[PDB]
């Protein structure tokens with residue numbers, strides 16, 4: 001991209017030991033900014049996003065090089081789903097079903113495109129409107145080789161364990177079905193209005209919970225069929241777990257049934 005066309009604002013949206021995000025520009029955009037191979041990760045993330053064309057996935061404008069390495073994408077003005085919900089706890093349950101269903105349409109596309117996200121969390125879903133969600137954060141994402149059904153992580157990175165399926169933790173095997181597991185945690189998060197999953201527990205304690213067969217409980221006011229769907233996403237054995245075709249069709253139908261009423 002051509003820096004001269006881009007305009008940064010002083011206030012960062014988020015920061016950390018990784019980098020920072022800012023607002024820019026005719027089209028409004030979001031910019032992730034570095035603070036040796038953190039560039040490679042960003043280029044890798046840029047490479048992934050370039051291949052993705054879907055309404056429910058944040059669309060990349062491009063990458064830019066100046067005082068920092070910058071990834072430029074379309075703006076989702078309302079920001080991370082988890083925070084939004086925390087700040088707006090009277091969002092209707094129909095509207096949450098709407099939002100998660102949109103993530104599942106996005107995830108069915110990614111599944112269909114044979115990409116695995118590897119970081120599907122409520123924090124990584126951004127809101128364009130109250131009624132339009134997009135999937136963000138493809139920094140951990142991998143294209144599946146033509147000859148493979150999963151991505152084999154060759155080392156333990158800094159992993160969001162509370163979002164990760166047993167096969168990820170146990171075998172480092174990342175598939176679309178691993179992302180489905182995460183979708184369940186994401187589902188739980190959305191219906192819990194941006195509560196952190198497995199609160200008060202270390203990652204190793206979460207594994208011990210799940211191995212026993214213990215699951216996070218039904219969020220207050222979450223329809224039972226949506227909690228059922230979460231638990232189905234939390235099938236321990238990845239063979240018996242649904243992919244997003246099944247998951248999205250479950251949500252698709254339910255969201256229309258819930259439209260049927262009002």
Ligand SMILES: FC(F)(F)c1ccnc(Nc2cccc(-c3cccc(N4CCNCC4)c3)n2)c1
Pocket residue numbers: 013014015021030031032058073074075076077078079080123124125126136137
């Ligand atoms: F992902 C992104 F590149 F930063 C991006 C892309 C497109 N639109 C936005 N929009 C907004 C709008 C408002 C606040 C934020 C924001 C603030 C802190 C952290 C994060 N995030 C980023 C997503 N992953 C977990 C942390 C996002 N973002 C962001």
